[PDB]
Every structure is written in C-alpha cells, then in structure tokens.
Design an enzyme around this catalytic site. Sequence first.
Site, PDB file in Angstrom:
ATOM      1  N   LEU A  34       0.815  -1.210   0.000  1.00 31.96           N
ATOM      2  CA  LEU A  34       0.000   0.000   0.000  1.00 31.96           C
ATOM      3  C   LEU A  34       0.851   1.263   0.000  1.00 31.96           C
ATOM      4  O   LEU A  34       0.433   2.290  -0.546  1.00 31.96           O
ATOM      5  CB  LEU A  34      -0.935   0.002   1.208  1.00 31.96           C
ATOM      6  CG  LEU A  34      -1.918  -1.164   1.315  1.00 31.96           C
ATOM      7  CD1 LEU A  34      -2.766  -1.027   2.567  1.00 31.96           C
ATOM      8  CD2 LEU A  34      -2.795  -1.232   0.077  1.00 31.96           C
ATOM      9  N   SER A  38      10.216   6.409   4.603  1.00 27.47           N
ATOM     10  CA  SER A  38      11.173   6.373   5.705  1.00 27.47           C
ATOM     11  C   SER A  38      10.597   5.651   6.915  1.00 27.47           C
ATOM     12  O   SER A  38      11.343   5.025   7.678  1.00 27.47           O
ATOM     13  CB  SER A  38      11.595   7.793   6.079  1.00 27.47           C
ATOM     14  OG  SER A  38      10.476   8.568   6.475  1.00 27.47           O
ATOM     15  N   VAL A  42       4.159  -0.522   4.064  1.00 27.66           N
ATOM     16  CA  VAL A  42       2.817  -0.960   4.428  1.00 27.66           C
ATOM     17  C   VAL A  42       2.317  -1.899   3.341  1.00 27.66           C
ATOM     18  O   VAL A  42       2.370  -1.561   2.152  1.00 27.66           O
ATOM     19  CB  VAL A  42       1.854   0.228   4.603  1.00 27.66           C
ATOM     20  CG1 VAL A  42       0.469  -0.266   4.993  1.00 27.66           C
ATOM     21  CG2 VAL A  42       2.393   1.199   5.641  1.00 27.66           C
ATOM     22  N   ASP A 151      -1.625  15.236  14.295  1.00 26.91           N
ATOM     23  CA  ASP A 151      -1.277  15.041  12.893  1.00 26.91           C
ATOM     24  C   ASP A 151      -2.524  14.750  12.069  1.00 26.91           C
ATOM     25  O   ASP A 151      -2.525  13.867  11.204  1.00 26.91           O
ATOM     26  CB  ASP A 151      -0.252  13.919  12.724  1.00 26.91           C
ATOM     27  CG  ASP A 151       0.488  14.001  11.402  1.00 26.91           C
ATOM     28  OD1 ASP A 151       0.534  15.108  10.822  1.00 26.91           O
ATOM     29  OD2 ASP A 151       1.018  12.964  10.944  1.00 26.91           O
ATOM     30  N   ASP A 169      -2.924   6.666  11.966  1.00 20.08           N
ATOM     31  CA  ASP A 169      -1.570   7.151  12.223  1.00 20.08           C
ATOM     32  C   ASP A 169      -1.477   7.893  13.553  1.00 20.08           C
ATOM     33  O   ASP A 169      -1.509   9.126  13.586  1.00 20.08           O
ATOM     34  CB  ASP A 169      -1.090   8.048  11.078  1.00 20.08           C
ATOM     35  CG  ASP A 169       0.417   8.261  11.095  1.00 20.08           C
ATOM     36  OD1 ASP A 169       1.082   7.755  12.023  1.00 20.08           O
ATOM     37  OD2 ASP A 169       0.937   8.926  10.173  1.00 20.08           O
ATOM     38  N   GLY A 171       1.148   7.929  15.561  1.00 13.75           N
ATOM     39  CA  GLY A 171       2.546   7.992  15.960  1.00 13.75           C
ATOM     40  C   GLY A 171       2.890   9.250  16.733  1.00 13.75           C
ATOM     41  O   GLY A 171       3.735   9.224  17.633  1.00 13.75           O
TER      42      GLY A 171
HETATM   43  C1  LIG Z   1      -0.791  -0.496   8.557  1.00 12.32           C
HETATM   44  C2  LIG Z   1      -1.145   0.577   9.566  1.00 12.32           C
HETATM   45  C3  LIG Z   1      -0.625   0.563  10.868  1.00 12.32           C
HETATM   46  C4  LIG Z   1      -0.954   1.559  11.804  1.00 12.32           C
HETATM   47  C5  LIG Z   1      -1.818   2.595  11.446  1.00 12.32           C
HETATM   48  O1  LIG Z   1      -2.173   3.596  12.328  1.00 12.32           O
HETATM   49  C6  LIG Z   1      -2.375   2.673  10.158  1.00 12.32           C
HETATM   50  C7  LIG Z   1      -3.305   3.780   9.753  1.00 12.32           C
HETATM   51  C8  LIG Z   1      -2.022   1.645   9.242  1.00 12.32           C
HETATM   52  N1  LIG Z   1      -2.556   1.696   7.932  1.00 12.32           N
HETATM   53  C9  LIG Z   1      -3.793   1.086   7.490  1.00 12.32           C
HETATM   54  N2  LIG Z   1      -4.572   0.358   8.406  1.00 12.32           N
HETATM   55  C10 LIG Z   1      -4.009   1.354   6.110  1.00 12.32           C
HETATM   56  C11 LIG Z   1      -5.161   0.893   5.325  1.00 12.32           C
HETATM   57  N3  LIG Z   1      -5.376   1.269   4.003  1.00 12.32           N
HETATM   58  O2  LIG Z   1      -6.017   0.129   5.822  1.00 12.32           O
HETATM   59  C12 LIG Z   1      -2.863   2.169   5.661  1.00 12.32           C
HETATM   60  N4  LIG Z   1      -2.535   2.705   4.470  1.00 12.32           N
HETATM   61  C13 LIG Z   1      -1.328   3.449   4.392  1.00 12.32           C
HETATM   62  C14 LIG Z   1      -0.955   4.039   3.113  1.00 12.32           C
HETATM   63  C15 LIG Z   1       0.207   4.764   3.013  1.00 12.32           C
HETATM   64 BR1  LIG Z   1       0.697   5.558   1.276  1.00 12.32          BR
HETATM   65  C16 LIG Z   1       1.081   4.975   4.099  1.00 12.32           C
HETATM   66  C17 LIG Z   1       0.737   4.415   5.326  1.00 12.32           C
HETATM   67  C18 LIG Z   1      -0.491   3.635   5.489  1.00 12.32           C
HETATM   68  N5  LIG Z   1      -0.811   3.079   6.756  1.00 12.32           N
HETATM   69  C19 LIG Z   1      -1.976   2.372   6.798  1.00 12.32           C
END
Ligand SMILES: Cc1ccc(O)c(C)c1-n1c(N)c(C(N)=O)c2nc3cc(Br)ccc3nc21
EC number: 2.7.11.1
Length: 276
Positions: A34, A38, A42, A151, A169, A171
């Site tokens: 996806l 850095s 995903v 954020d 996100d 973080g």
């Molecule tokens: C994998 C993950 C871990 C913790 C978190 O808080 C989140 C929001 C996710 N997470 C999803 N559950 C995405 C989704 N489509 O379900 C998803 N898509 C992304 C696309 C890009 Br470009 C960059 C980062 C992404 N992180 C994602």
Amino acid sequence: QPRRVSFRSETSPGYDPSRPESFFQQSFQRLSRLGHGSYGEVFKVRSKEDGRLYAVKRSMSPFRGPKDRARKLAEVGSHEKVGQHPCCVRLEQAWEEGGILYLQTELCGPSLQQHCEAWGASLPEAQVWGYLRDTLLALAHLHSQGLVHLDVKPANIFLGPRGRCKLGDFGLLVELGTEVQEGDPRYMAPELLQGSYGTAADVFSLGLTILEVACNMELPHGGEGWQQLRQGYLPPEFTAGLSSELRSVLVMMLEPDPKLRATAEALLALPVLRQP
Ligand SMILES: Cc1ccc(O)c(C)c1-n1c(N)c(C(N)=O)c2nc3cc(Br)ccc3nc21
C-alpha cells in the site's frame, strides 16, 4: 525470534519456529504494498490464520539503539490508548523481530488524500459533511481520554464504505497529563508555535483539513498565506463555493484562540453536524 509488543501472549499455527523465515513471511500473504517510505513499508496482506484481510506496516531498518526502539514502539502504546472506536483504525496485534516493528491493523480503503487527488476538484459538500462528522467523532473519542492526535490531515484519514472514514496514524499522539514530536506545519494550530499543546490543536487541524478538501486548495507551509489562514478570517477567493453552514463551522474550528475555539463535542452537538 518474533516477540509480541503491547503496553497492557508475548510468546501461531501457520508459523513454525523451526523454519528460518520470518513470522510475517510465514503467517501472511503479501497481496500488495500500500505504501513505502522512511517509516517503512505498508502491505495489504491476507492472514494465513483466519483468512481475513489486514494491513501490516513494518519499519524500514532495524533498531539503531534503545531510544529508536522505544520511539517506534511508542506508536503501539498510543494505538492502545485510543482503543476500539468506529471512527478510529483498529489495531489487531503488534510484534517485533530482528529489530523490525510490525503493526497489524484492519484494512481500510484509500486515504482522503488519494481520493481528492483522484477526484481532481473540490469534493461535493455532501461527502465533506460526512467526513467532517466521522473525524469529529474520532477526535471527540481521543479528546475525552486526554489524547491529542497532532497530525490530523487528509493522508491520515482513511475512507470507508458508504461515505464513512476513519482516523489513523497515531505515531505523534500525546497524552495530556499533569514528549512531543514535530507535526505538519500546513495543519499546525497557531498556538503550537508558542508551545501551547491541547486538544484544541486537533480541531484546528481538522478545520484546515476540511478547508483543503472542500475547496481544493493547497495549504501553505509558511509565509503570509500561512498567517492569513490563522488570523480568524477565511480566504474569500477559494471559499466562495462554500455554503453558509459549512463556512460558519469552519470559522468555529479555525478560531486562533485555543480558549475560544470550539470543541469536537460542541461541534457534534450542532444540528447541521447531527447524523441525518
Ligand atoms: C498499517 C497501519 C498501521 C498503523 C496505522 O495507524 C495505520 C493507519 C495503518 N494503515 C492502514 N490500516 C491502512 C489501510 N489502508 O487500511 C494504511 N494505508 C497506508 C498508506 C500509506 Br501511502 C502509508 C501508510 C499507510 N498506513 C496504513
């Protein structure tokens, strides 16, 4: 060896410890990637345990030291503090292996950033109102527990079926209590420059988030345009298409004074933002 990560079974059928492959490669089928950066990579994966669809993010490089490990693992802790909420991305499990941190969450649709790039124009206000309500519901959930996202932006809002969206996100999430990381200056509340951190910052970020997607306007990183969006008045050149109701809600959210800026509960209590 893979070890579970949680801040609350720290020790799988599809994964054999005798095999040399990692738990991620042995217990998941990487359908697609996806995103990458850095932060790491995903993947859209299908679990070899229950077969349901999930998204797994792994860090790019192994832990450099104890500070790097504790910094990356802090995201798992912040995700647990949020808890299960219909407008917040749900975390299934998190684990570390070989200095790499894995976070497994529910699979969501495309981010609001991707949707607006594809639409290539101002989003229909009907879609905007629903996205504003769902993100306010998520923000109210975080703010009630004393959490600030810090954020909120289109890239961190993920679309779902039937015009719903979820906030993601965590973080940069901090817990207000009796360690702040840098955020996106385009969505930064004006009080953050003076170090005043509070739940009101998220409301201002969502205000600029909605303003960006509802008017198809690029938010400035800095300069005079950065100030104009933070002096209490909206830019008339792009906000002409906005309805009177949406414009008034944006003025409430973009109040420069944190003490005067409306809260997520106050906005959700308004009749325009009540679920129709
Ligand atoms: C994998 C993950 C871990 C913790 C978190 O808080 C989140 C929001 C996710 N997470 C999803 N559950 C995405 C989704 N489509 O379900 C998803 N898509 C992304 C696309 C890009 Br470009 C960059 C980062 C992404 N992180 C994602």
